[PDB]
Amino acid sequence: LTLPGTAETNLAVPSNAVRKVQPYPIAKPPSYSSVDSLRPARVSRMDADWATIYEQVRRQVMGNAYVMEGEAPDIDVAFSQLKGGNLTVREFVRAVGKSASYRTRFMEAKSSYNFVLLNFKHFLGRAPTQEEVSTHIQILATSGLEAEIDSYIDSDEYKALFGDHVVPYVVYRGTYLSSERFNRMVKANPGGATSDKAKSNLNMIATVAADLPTDAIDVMRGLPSPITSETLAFGTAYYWAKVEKEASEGRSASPIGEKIGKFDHAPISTYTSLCSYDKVNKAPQISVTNVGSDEHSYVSVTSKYIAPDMAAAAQMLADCQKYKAGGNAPTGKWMKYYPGTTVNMAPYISLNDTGSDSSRTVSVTLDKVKIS
């Protein structure tokens, strides 16, 4: 809408008011990168026509959206200026991302954490680290949608990889800033016939990019690698491991079990009296409200709640690591194993009949809200 020549909008850096448009598209990154010779060639503004620039912007920025002809007129607003040269293809995907057709299939329907991971998949063509999420999740908290898409397009990572004339794509650069950052990029970017719309939870890179260890599974990276770079290893060896990561990646089998949350349970023969291993760690999940005459009391049975292994990390080890000065004055061995144990009567309150008392011995130590 603005001008027939516009390199940069919104005046974020000071040196874009004097910056020209790029007269030619930018070069490839200068490292070796053995994978990209098997890859198809990148599509730019000045080598290809508008039939395939629109398809690859749908194949990368829109994921695989299946935009119809009456669907997305906001993209048809933004595409009609790109064919007139009124904005570059760098600014065009800023107009695609800020549009509501990008919002009404990636922002409202996916989760809050998954919206950041799809933005690195579409705009930068990779998958972020945890520190890249934690700087991008505050823009969704304090500044909203429009400033968060400005963090990709006005970044220096975009302008060095694509510049003003190159459609976004999966850039294999060989020497990466982290060894995770290759194979988390590859796992985030599968090949053809995959979209983002069915996986309303993505749930697998949402927990590999969540904690900084637990790098993702090898068959989830041998799957979208290119060809004469996967073969003689995907006939039937890892192929059944694939056709599984696919019934689990599809329908979003939540990885509490095998990926993170890793608890050595006891064998089933060890208890056998608290039996029926479907049950075994189920509790009543009780909730009361007690407000007016609509307050309900929702007593559900809960699921097999696991020891969380971090609330047992903060406390019982980091917390309460006191246990000091335990010589406890060893004099006179009349005791037996119970040095000071009160009989501890504890009368269960005499509601006049059918209520009775039992007693138990226990070692007693005075608490810390006690004497002086």
Partner 1 sequence: MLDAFSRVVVNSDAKAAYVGGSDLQALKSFIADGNKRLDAVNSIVSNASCMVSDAVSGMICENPGLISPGGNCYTNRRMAACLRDGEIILRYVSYALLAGDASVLEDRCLNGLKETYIALGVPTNSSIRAVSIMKAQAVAFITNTATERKMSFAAGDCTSLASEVASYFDRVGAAIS
Partner 2 sequence: MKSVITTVVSAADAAGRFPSNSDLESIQGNIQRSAARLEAAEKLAGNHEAVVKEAGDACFAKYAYLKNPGEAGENQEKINKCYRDVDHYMRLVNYCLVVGGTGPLDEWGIAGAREVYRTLNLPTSAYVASIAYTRDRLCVPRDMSAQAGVEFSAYLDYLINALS
Ligand X SMILES: *[C@H](C)[C@H]1/C(=C/C2=NC(=C\c3[nH]c(C[C@H]4NC(=O)C(C=C)=C4C)c(C)c3CCC(=O)O)/C(CCC(=O)O)=C2C)NC(=O)[C@@H]1C
Residues 151-210 that bind partner 1 (CB under 8 A): 190-195, 197-203, 206-207, 210
Pick one of 7, 100, 139, 261: the residue that binds partner 1 (CB under 8 A).
261
Pairing of strands 284-285, 300-301: antiparallel
Contact between 1 and partner 1 (CB under 8 A)?
A: no
Map residues 54-83 to x or -, x wherever contact with partner 2 holds by CB under 8 A.
--------------xxxxxxxxxx------
Residues of span 329-368 touching ligand X by CB under 6 A = 329, 335, 339-340, 347, 350, 352, 355-357, 365, 367-368
What's the per-residue H, E or C state across 65-123? CCCCCCCCHHHHHHHHHHCCCCCCHHHHHHHHHHCHHHHHHHCCCCCHHHHHHHHHHHH
If contact means CB under 5 to 8 A according to the sort of partner, which of partner 2, ligand X, partner 1, none does residue 86 touch? ligand X
Instruction: Flag whether 344 is marked binding.
Output: yes
Partner interacting with residue 98 (select from ligand X, partner 2, partner 1, none; CB below 5-8 Å by kind): partner 2
Least distance from partner 1 to the Cβ atom of residue 81, Å = 27
Helix residue spans in 264-358 (DSSP H): 268-271, 311-313
Say if residues 96 and 87 touch (Cβ distance below 8 Å): no
Site string for partner 2, 95-134 (x = CB under 8 A): ---xxxx-xx--xx--------------------------
In the complex, residue closest to ligand X by CB = 112
Judged by CB under 6 A, the residue of 16, 56, 81, 194 near ligand X is: 81
Of all helices (H) and strands (E), which one includes residue 60? Answer: helix 50-60
266 annotated as a binding-site residue:
yes
Residue 74 binds what, of ligand X, partner 1, partner 2, none (CB under 5 to 8 Å, by partner type)?
partner 2
- Shorter beta-carbon distance to partner 2: residue 141 or 274: 141
Buried-state track 229-247, b at ≥16 Cβ within 10 A, e below 16: eeeeebeeebeebeeebee
Q: Give the integer Cα–Cα distance in Å for 290 and 69.
A: 54
The string of DSSP letters for 129-164 reads -HHHHHHHTTHHHHT-SHHHHHHHHTSHHHHHHTTT
Contact pattern for partner 2 over residues 9 through 48, marking x by CB under 8 A: ----------------------------------------
Least distance CB 34 / ligand X (angstroms): 34
Number of residues that bind ligand X (CB under 6 A): 38
How far apart, in whole angstroms, are the C-alpha atoms of residue 24 and residue 12?
Answer: 23
Q: Which is nearer to ligand X, 43 or 133 (CB)?
A: 133
Q: Does 145 bind partner 2 (CB under 8 A)?
A: yes
For 318, the token pair is: 């980091």
The span from the CA of 138 to the CA of 253, in Å, is: 28
Residue 246 and residue 244: Cα distance in Å, rounded? 5
What is the C-alpha to C-alpha distance for residues 110 and 100, in angstroms, rounded to an integer? Answer: 14
* Residues written for the chain: 372
Q: What are phi and psi of 331, to 5 degrees?
A: -120, 135
Burial of 56 (0-12, 13-18, 19+ CB in 10 A): middle
- Smallest distance from the beta carbon of 201 to ligand X, in angstroms? 13
272 binds ligand X (CB under 6 A): no
Positions in the binding site for partner 2 (CB under 8 A): 68-77, 98-101, 103-104, 107-108, 140-146
Positions in the binding site for ligand X (CB under 6 A): 1, 77, 80-81, 83-84, 86, 112-113, 133-134, 137, 265-266, 271, 274, 280-281, 288-290, 295, 297, 328-329, 335, 339-340, 347, 350, 352, 355-357, 365, 367-369
